[PDB]
Design a binder for this molecule. Structure first.
Ligand SMILES: NC(=[NH2+])NCCC[C@H](N)C(=O)O
Ligand SMILES: O=C(O)CCC(=O)C(=O)O
Ligand SMILES: O=C(O)CCC(=O)C(=O)O
Ligand SMILES: [Fe+3]
Lengths: 340, 338
């Protein structure tokens, strides 16, 4: 049966907005995704993305009302929609690399992730990430167990705002779990300003920090080298004091040269977020949208077998304002940031 | 070729949009009631599919001038006389058109208003007012409404301006112009991309166009932007598809920047000449892409007898979250309450 509710974390009373699909809602969503897979080339082909926001209107009405409430909740951490259909037998094995993960059997889950995403905003990708795919793949890769990227397993994916260095960073990160037999978590933390010295909060609102791109990441790429070598002075907190946005990377953020007070405030924040991390586990057919304006996220160490049974998610970036990134996109309809 | 995207409603589509608007009017008090606006994005999904498809094509077209939806139902007899002032224009009979404007608008983004414009109403009224004939505000008639980016002065200016024509007996034209960078040349484009201009709030944000009971402090932000405008650009974004931000009556080059003053002078002559007409008849709704075009209104003679031209108007943002510093709370839609 259909249900939805608010799951608090610390003082964040709407931290998690949880929706449980009824069996009929799960079937309705699956039928729409399967129809899209019959009519359109790819989950991120131009033909589909031109239509995706209107096709998303055919998702179950009760679900659409709850997603719309989440979209306008400026204190949201994670929207979680549980109980989508995943046919494990038909899906087949977890591929051994994202380069082999855009499979025919998994297309219907990419389509469904884009349909849910398109209720929140417009889907985008990154030229430097998984060949500029909008629907990307999160799965463990043999030989990258001890890497700083989403294909890690043995070593914690360090928490960060997604693409923290970039003015074009996503408003939401979406994750559609295809399988997760060992219940491996995404880590999540937001700032509780009532747990931090107001003077530290004041410092974090100042343009007193450098956020550099991961090595992961032409006038755009001229800006990417300038971002490593001559990083702009940016704030970590921005907006209304009652609902500040957060932008920080635990591995790639420093205070401006000689700003010892900023260095102090940054390390106070890093210790606070480190201590406030909680977990969201997505079972097969569970989809999460993290509000990238409000939370950092990462992933816990886990034990990959590399036998075709490993954890596998589809991943997407969503922007509230596609138009604002036009300088960094190839043409009006292109969704790949840094393509031109 | 597709700068103006038009859909003419079939009789069934017109009836379906009217029925949805009347269902909203039965449920909610005001067309900008908080409970309605919370629900508006999902209620808008019940508009006719053919219309939602064309609105979505318009939304993703970064060279759009205006989406025009023709032939909505307007009952002229039931509507009654055109009010003599926007303050009196929140009429029972006109509620249904307010609701329908917000439903169309909510396909493109989230609706916002201004603390300092028509007393912070989200659904506003464009109608001629006796004594404002020669003014620079939307209630003018005799003096052409100068072309402008809506709320050009503000970083929170709308992405779309929605205009729902309730009546327009003399077919008075809305004016529209975009910028062709090729026609002004790379030299002037380079200058307009520079932060070398002052854009002041227009007169409708002044206490002279709001109720006298409105707090003085609502207006401190506007008066600061009139007195001490920031140095800003007129063009931004991709060179191949630049956004436009200029008000023909409230924009100047920064003192001493003769190059900038020349570029502005060139832009004004280019836009003033290319300025073209769109007539919104009763039941016609337009959404101007406020990132791409300036707009205005041709001069006309008002009769002031209750038969005059009357539009409902709305501001639409692609990104409500970005203005949270200027809004009272998460759901509040009135810019300048913080
Ligand atoms: N150049 C101008 N007249 N600018 C102001 C335009 C009218 C303004 N949008 C109003 O609501 O009154
Ligand atoms: O693997 C996860 O749970 C999270 C991965 C992710 O969101 C990311 O790649 O940034
Ligand atoms: O009256 C019109 O058609 C345009 C109105 C307008 O430009 C405005 O209200 O700012
Ligand atoms: Fe205007």
């Amino acid at each position: 049966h259909h249900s939805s509710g608010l799951v608090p974390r610390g003082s964040h009373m709407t931290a998690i907005r949880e929706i449980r699909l009824s069996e009929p809602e799960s079937a309705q969503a699956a039928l729409l995704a399967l129809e899209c897979a019959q009519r359109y080339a790819e989950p991120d082909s131009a033909d589909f993305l031109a239509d995706a926001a209107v096709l998303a209107h055919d998702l179950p009405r009760a679900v659409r009302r709850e997603v719309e409430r989440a979209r306008l909740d400026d204190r949201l951490h994670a929207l979680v929609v549980r109980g989508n259909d995943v046919d494990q037998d038909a899906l087949g094995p977890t591929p051994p690399h994202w380069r082999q993960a855009r499979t025919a059997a998994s297309r219907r889950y990419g389509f469904l992730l884009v349909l849910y995403a398109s209720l929140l905003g417009d889907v985008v990708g990154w030229a430097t990430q998984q060949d500029g795919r909008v629907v990307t793949d999160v799965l463990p890769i043999e030989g990258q167990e001890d890497s700083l990227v989403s294909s890690s397993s043995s070593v914690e994916l360090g928490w960060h705002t997604e693409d923290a260095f970039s003015p074009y960073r996503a408003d939401y990160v979406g994750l559609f779990s295809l399988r997760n037999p060992d219940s491996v978590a995404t880590t999540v933390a937001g700032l509780d300003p009532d747990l931090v010295g107001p003077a530290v909060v004041d410092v974090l609102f100042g343009e007193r920090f450098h956020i550099r791109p991961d090595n992961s990441h032409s006038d755009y790429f001229a800006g990417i080298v300038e971002a490593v070598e001559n990083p702009r002075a940016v704030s970590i907190l921005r907006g209304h004091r009652d609902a500040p946005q957060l932008c920080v990377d635990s591995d790639f953020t420093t205070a401006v040269d000689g700003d010892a007070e900023a260095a102090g405030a940054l390390d106070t924040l890093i210790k606070h977020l480190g201590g406030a991390l909680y977990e969201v586990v997505l079972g097969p057919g569970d989809v999460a949208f993290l509000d990238n304006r409000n939370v950092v996220h990462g992933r816990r160490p886990f034990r990959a077998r590399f036998d075709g049974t490993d954890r596998w998610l589809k991943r997407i970036n969503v922007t509230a304002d596609l138009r604002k990134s036009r300088a960094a996109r190839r043409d009006a309809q292109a969704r790949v940031l840094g393509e031109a």
